[PDB]
Design a protein around this ligand. Structure first.
Ligand SMILES: [Mg+2]
Ligand SMILES: [Mg+2]
Ligand SMILES: [Mg+2]
Ligand SMILES: [Mg+2]
Ligand SMILES: [Mg+2]
Ligand SMILES: [Mg+2]
Ligand SMILES: [Mg+2]
Ligand SMILES: [Mg+2]
Ligand SMILES: [Mg+2]
Ligand SMILES: [Mg+2]
Ligand SMILES: [Mg+2]
Ligand SMILES: [Mg+2]
Ligand SMILES: [Mg+2]
Ligand SMILES: [Mg+2]
Ligand SMILES: [Mg+2]
Ligand SMILES: [Mg+2]
Ligand SMILES: [Mg+2]
Lengths: 206, 56, 63, 141, 56, 145, 143, 63, 55, 70
RNA sequence: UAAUUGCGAUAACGAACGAGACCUUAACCUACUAAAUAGUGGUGCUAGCAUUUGCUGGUUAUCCACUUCUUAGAGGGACUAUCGGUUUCAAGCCGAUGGAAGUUUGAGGCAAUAACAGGUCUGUGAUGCCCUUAGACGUUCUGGGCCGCACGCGCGCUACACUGACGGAGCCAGCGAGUCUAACCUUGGCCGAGAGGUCUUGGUAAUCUUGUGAAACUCCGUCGUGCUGGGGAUAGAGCAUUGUAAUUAUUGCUCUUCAACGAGGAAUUCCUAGUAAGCGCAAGUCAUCAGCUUGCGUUGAUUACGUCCCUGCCCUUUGUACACACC
């Protein structure tokens, strides 16, 4: 990669990967393709980044929320429930650990496994509350791609958080564990179950 | 003397208020319209605005 | 499972009493030239892609 | 006197000033090499401008930066801004325009807001709540 | 007949859990004075629109 | 630090100071289930007796334990500052003590009794099962007794 | 190459300077060490037991090398953390002006720091020496 | 929402009325015109006016 | 300060303020001009203070 | 206070034998084996690293990661 | 449209108050004027490490120069600009590009007519009337009380932990205030485990406290799921501080004592971007006392970008025997 060194020296692994390929903590942004129709344009993956910490303005326009790198979107949803509001450096680190753990098990790309877990837990159709007067039935509706991504992330993180509460396992482990099972849904994961049953309920009313 | 600049400017403001009051009570039948004070070397100057200055 | 893919043609408007539901006309990418109007859940713009878990059905007004 | 410029960067109330002169390629923040900077999770943030434009191009210059104000994040976004803005300010008065314009192109394409300062800023709180928007709790009766 | 124990073993009077008690809100617009006023005495104070020209 | 072995030497549930102590918990914190000895006091005592903090309760030695007790009931001779002790300057003999185990139950009564017997308001307040330290008794402290 | 402590990572510098004075034996370690709390805003004393006087002195040293002059009040405020008031909210509190003042005299009698004019304590010319010395030693571990 | 008040719209009407020779499709020079030709108390007000004199100008050329 | 003299009503705080502007100009002069400059250029509201030397 | 707190030489050997086939080993992974409460677990990771059987791909407190040796 | 904000229709045409304008604060100036009470480069003077020039500091004036950063005067800048979609191709609205900034640029101040038996006579030496006025309802002095505890309701603080407690270590803000006929903000040095004490010192302040080295946070360890080292209520014993006085314990410090609380029923509050939430700090009060408020900055999300279902209020239409106006 044609090394070069100046007064204050920049390290090898630092020099090497950075100017070669623009990639994660260290992980490949290339490959990593969304295996489902739609769900593309709503999952970021190129443009590539270094860490999941970015100060963007994603909130001031309706759909621009989707242009955020989806790894970072996964992290943002990690910091919540009171005490953990803010505290992204915490979260950023947890993701880094999580990715490494996911990579150890069943190889591939941990950033790809993330993409798998997202696409698989998004409900295709759902129900809402339509009054009709008095006792209200439930109307089936087909949920958007955007909500499909959001709810996928929210479902994944929550289930991991609750599974990481009051037990020896850490967040990164359970977070990984969830994503792994949610790669191809094993129905052993909090997220998949909730997805399937949202389409189970949406099926019985139709 | 020897005052803070902050306390000094405030103190002067309070001085105007109390002075302004005393005239508004005292000079009422002279048509007291309000005052202004000019701080100079050697003197403090107080100008009485009144429609009727012959009684003042 | 007979999965069916459809692209959003148009944004018709908001249904539902609360109003968090949108009426949308779509075109399937596999075997085009037919359009059905579907009720969505989340936020939607034109050229999105809705996965219709059952190919032939539709709805109009909600309460 | 040698060829030299000075730039800054701002995020929140943090303002990071950087002096870019001609030299053997040192990069220093307040006391020290750019190679620490600790948060260190955010380390690759302030590396970013170097690797965006390529690890060379600093060989002919010297970079020294100092930060006052802000916080352990707020300053990190500020210094990387002053580093990149400086490299592009240097080619402005010394190298040729077309090299500069390629730098602004290689930066802005990706960016973080590297040449451009984030305009966000704390909103004044008002009475009736602990927050700017937030109100207090009311019980009715 | 003193201390926590005794009080703890006693029932709590109902007046504890009672309400705001109101007592004369909805009568607020109806004067209790029984007097009222008179148009003449009011026209002396505030003048009447009948004599207005002579005022201007 | 290291991987250890021992054999059968360590025993769970060792008894000292008229109380029981769990063997598998670290010795500094193992000493705390005894009345009168908190986290601080436990720590300093172990350090003064020259015992390893990384050890559990079930380990050490019948001699180490014996030493630990000896210091707890004579803190002032083994050079502990006596701002470090729970009962100092008495009110009878003026001496400095540290009351331990079953005895701390005894010295609460003694003290509590002196107030009541002397008819001090703090005493009277105790006898009524109320809060002494002067806190408002309207809202707080309902269930209690 | 040439070296300043500014070229060494904050943590593993002091750790190496800590392990230095430890290895050394010329200390002045008052003896109320292991019984003291390092602040009123702490629950428990340092976990290092025999130690940690080195670590602070090594911390203290470096901090005072990094600037003109510092006093006891400045170190009290530096090292002092947040104290749990129990059921009451947290507040910032200063640390012990004994541990710090005695650390200042024990490093001075050892010649790494001197009482400065203007007030405070200035890094000793001999201290620059020794600090820049074990600094470069630490960069040897990464060679 | 940005809706120009009467005062802005009213002046712009009155300007394009009598000053159509000169003005322009360009705000920047129209701005400079107003400072010379008209009396306005604030920079902000003038820009609001000059901006709308420019809008009306632009579409007049379309009929 | 709260607006109400009493306590009733939703609690409306109101904050007044007073701005203090302070300038200084250094002159190297004889005795004449200073004394000429201090007596005149007087003004209500402008506090004029003239200090001396280096210390 | 439910098992897993001390040494029990049979456990030591259990470790040396059972650590392989673990793709992921850590504090949580050691406890899940019905043994080794978290303290000695954290020590175990260090001594198993003295020679082989685990590769330190991770770093720090609250997260440990090791892989079977190659 | 945020707006009787406009377009348009039009027996109306053109106008004023209120909205808008305006004013203040936060954003952009390598263009203007400058600064030992702000700061940079250079040079002396000077310390350390490497030595090959180097790297990192010291020196309220040893000098020379500058104004990017800081400060505040005068200006400039935005007008929803340009282009394109949509619409009576109207006012407008939406997307893209550019831009310090395009949600009234963000947040405030000011704010017409009219109503209420809203609240305040306990802010006023504002005030009608009534009451009282020497055994006083005047006033002062001693002491107690407003804190009193079977319980009902409301704003909150701290938590039930392992995105954690603890211990070392890293170590970064902003809005403020501070002493004259006085004792205010306090660096520094010693003594003390602590709280604190003592000797001195700078400051009427961009000059000194103060870079307010604040806290969450970041790092390395200890603990391991057990009411545990989570939690810190209650209570014992001792030491200090404010004050004439601390008992019903003003506050602070140390040891000990180690409660409820395993995410909270029916219900219900607040909120759309540097916002929510987490986090501390200054100021008000203040001799001493913040778990309160007013502002401040730090860390920094999820989800809408919609509707009239619930609730609240406005608008027409309509009825009226109400006009002191459904009390
Ligand atoms: Mg105990
Ligand atoms: Mg600190
Ligand atoms: Mg600390
Ligand atoms: Mg300037
Ligand atoms: Mg843009
Ligand atoms: Mg009334
Ligand atoms: Mg009044
Ligand atoms: Mg009261
Ligand atoms: Mg309230
Ligand atoms: Mg605790
Ligand atoms: Mg900590
Ligand atoms: Mg003592
Ligand atoms: Mg416990
Ligand atoms: Mg909850
Ligand atoms: Mg206060
Ligand atoms: Mg209050
Ligand atoms: Mg009618």
């Amino acid at each position: 990669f044609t090394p070069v060194v100046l007064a204050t020296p920049i390290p090898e692994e630092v020099q090497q990967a950075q100017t070669e390929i623009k990639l994660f903590n260290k992980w490949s942004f290339e490959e990593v393709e969304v295996k489902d129709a739609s769900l593309v344009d709503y999952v970021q993956v190129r443009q590539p980044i270094f860490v999941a910490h970015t100060a963007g303005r994603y909130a001031n326009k309706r759909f621009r929320k989707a242009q955020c790198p989806i790894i970072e979107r996964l992290t943002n949803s990690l910091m919540m429930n009171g005490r953990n509001n803010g505290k992204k450096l915490k979260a950023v680190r947890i993701i880094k650990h999580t990715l490494d753990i996911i990579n150890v098990l069943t190889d591939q790309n941990p950033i790809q496994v993330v993409v798998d877990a997202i696409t698989n837990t998004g409900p295709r159709e759902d129900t809402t509350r339509v009054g009709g007067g008095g006792a209200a039935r439930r109307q089936a509706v087909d949920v958007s791609p955007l909500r499909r991504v959001n709810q996928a992330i929210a479902l994944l993180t929550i289930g991991a958080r609750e599974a990481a509460f009051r037990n020896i396992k850490t967040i990164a482990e359970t977070l990984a564990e969830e994503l792994i099972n949610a790669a191809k849904g094993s129905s052993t994961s909090y997220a998949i179950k909730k997805k399937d049953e949202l389409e189970r309920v949406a099926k019985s009313n139709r | 003397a020897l005052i803070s600049k902050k306390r000094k400017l405030v103190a002067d403001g309070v001085f105007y208020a109390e002075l302004n009051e005393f005239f508004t009570r005292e000079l009422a039948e002279e048509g007291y319209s309000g005052v202004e004070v000019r701080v100079t070397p050697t003197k403090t100057e107080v100008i009485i605005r009144a429609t009727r200055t012959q009684d003042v | 499972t007979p999965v069916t893919l459809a692209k959003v043609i148009k944004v018709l408007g908001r249904t539902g009493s609360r109003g968090g539901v949108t009426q949308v006309r779509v075109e399937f990418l596999e075997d085009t030239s037919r359009t059905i109007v579907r009720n969505v859940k989340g936020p939607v713009r034109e050229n999105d892609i809705l996965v219709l878990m059952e190919s032939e059905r539709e709805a109009r007004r909600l309460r | 006197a040698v060829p030299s410029v000075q730039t800054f960067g701002k995020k929140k109330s943090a303002t990071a000033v950087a002096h870019v002169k001609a030299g053997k390629g040192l990069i220093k923040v307040n006391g020290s090499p750019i190679t620490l900077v600790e948060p260190e999770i955010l380390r690759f943030k302030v590396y970013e401008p170097l690797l965006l434009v390529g690890l060379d191009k600093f060989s002919n210059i010297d970079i020294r930066v100092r930060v006052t104000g802000g916080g352990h994040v707020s300053q990190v976004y500020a210094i990387r801004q002053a580093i990149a803005k400086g490299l592009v300010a240097y080619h402005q008065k010394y190298v040729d325009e077309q090299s500069k314009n390629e730098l602004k192109k290689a930066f802005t394409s990706y960016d973080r807001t590297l040449l451009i300062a984030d305009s966000r800023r704390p909103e004044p709180k008002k009475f009736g709540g602990k927050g700017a928007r937030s109100r207090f709790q009311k019980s009715y009766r | 007949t003193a201390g926590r124990r005794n009080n703890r073993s006693k029932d709590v009077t109902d007046s504890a859990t009672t309400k705001k008690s109101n007592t004369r809100r909805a009568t607020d617009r109806h004067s209790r004075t029984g007097k009222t006023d008179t148009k003449k005495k009011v026209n002396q104070g505030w003048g009447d629109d009948k004599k207005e020209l002579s005022a201007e | 630090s290291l991987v250890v072995q021992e054999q059968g030497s360590f025993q769970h549930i060792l008894r000292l100071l008229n109380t029981n102590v769990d063997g598998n918990i670290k010795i500094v914190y193992a000493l705390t289930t005894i009345k009168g000895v908190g986290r601080r006091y436990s720590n300093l005592v172990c350090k003064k007796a020259d015992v390893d903090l990384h050890k559990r309760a079930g380990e050490l030695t019948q001699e180490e334990l014996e030493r630990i007790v000896q210091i707890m009931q004579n803190p002032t001779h083994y050079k502990i500052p006596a701002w470090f002790l729970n009962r100092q300057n008495d009110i009878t003999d003026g001496k400095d003590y540290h009351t331990l185990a079953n005895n701390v139950e005894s010295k609460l009564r003694d003290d509590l009794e002196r107030l009541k017997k002397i008819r001090a308001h703090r005493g009277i307040r105790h006898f009524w099962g109320l809060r002494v330290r002067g806190q408002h008794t309207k809202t707080t402290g309902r269930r209690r007794a | 190459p040439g070296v300043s402590v500014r070229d060494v990572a904050a943590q593993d510098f002091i750790n190496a300077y800590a392990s230095f004075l430890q290895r050394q034996g010329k200390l002045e370690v008052p003896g109320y060490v292991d019984i003291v709390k390092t602040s009123s805003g702490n629950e428990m004393p340092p976990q290092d037991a025999e130690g940690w006087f080195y670590k602070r002195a090594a911390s203290v040293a470096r901090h005072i090398y990094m600037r003109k002059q510092v006093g006891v009040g400045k170190l009290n405020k530096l090292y002092g953390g947040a104290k749990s008031r129990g059921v009451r909210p947290y507040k910032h509190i200063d640390a012990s002006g004994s541990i710090n003042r005695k650390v200042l005299q024990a490093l001075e009698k050892i010649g790494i720091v001197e009482i400065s004019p203007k007030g405070g304590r200035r890094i000793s010319e001999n201290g620059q020496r020794d600090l820049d010395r074990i600094a470069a030693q630490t960069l040897e571990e990464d060679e | 929402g940005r809706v120009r008040t009467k005062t802005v719209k009213r002046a712009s009407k009155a300007l394009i009325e009598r000053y159509y020779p000169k003005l322009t499709l360009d705000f920047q020079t129209n701005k400079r015109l107003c400072d010379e030709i008209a009396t306005i108390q604030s920079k902000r007000l003038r820009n609001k006016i000059a901006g709308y004199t420019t809008h009306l100008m632009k579409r007049i050329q379309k009929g | 300060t709260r607006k109400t003299p009493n306590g009733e009503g939703s609690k409306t705080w109101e904050t007044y303020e007073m701005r203090i502007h302070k300038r200084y100009i250094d002159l190297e002069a004889p005795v004449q001009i200073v004394k000429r400059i201090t007596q005149i250029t007087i003004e209500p509201g402008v506090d004029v203070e003239v200090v001396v030397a280096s210390n | 206070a439910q098992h897993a707190v001390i040494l029990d030489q049979e456990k030591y050997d259990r470790i040396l034998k059972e650590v392989p086939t673990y793709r992921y080993v850590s504090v949580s992974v050691l406890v899940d084996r019905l043994k080794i409460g978290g303290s000695l677990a954290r020590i175990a990771l260090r001594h198993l690293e003295k020679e082989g059987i685990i590769k330190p791909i991770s770093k720090h407190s609250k997260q440990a990661i090791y892989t079977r040796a190659t």
